[PDB]
């Protein structure tokens with residue numbers, strides 16, 4: 296009871312802004328994915 | 344290693360032993376036919392079966408639009424730039440991810456593995 300009635304004051308939510316990171320983080324994630332793709336391509340070629 | 348057929352009833356020749364001369368004979372049991380066995384070997388068993396796939400690879404595979412092709416590795420015979428490559432494509436091939444290239448361009452049909 297007391298915690299719900301305090302959240303009546305503070306409030307809680309979820310939104311689009313909660314599901315997006317900074318542009319630097321997006322660039323880092325893209326760089327990591329590109330590096331992973333390059334490494335797996337190199338592994339495929341080495342196995343070939 | 345192979346199978347030889349009779350010429351009278353066209354049945355299968357089984358190996359027989361010529362007791363009097365001590366030579367391998369192929370004698371059909373459907374009739375009385377007996378023939379001299381040239382190879383002197385009957386059965387060969389490659390249980391590890393180090394078989395070459397390019398002998399089982401047909402040239403028209405190069406006509407497949409669903410197969411990848413690179414200009415990196417040229418043909419040995421005709422030196423054509425573009426060649427289609429694919430894996431073993433065969434079961435019980437042990438553990439093999441090696442590449443079997445087939446040269447494109449008509450009437451070439453050359454194949455090679457690297």
Ligand SMILES: [Zn+2]
Nearest residue numbers: 349352371374
């Ligand atoms: Zn016969």
Ligand SMILES: [Zn+2]
Nearest residue numbers: 418421446451
């Ligand atoms: Zn060629």
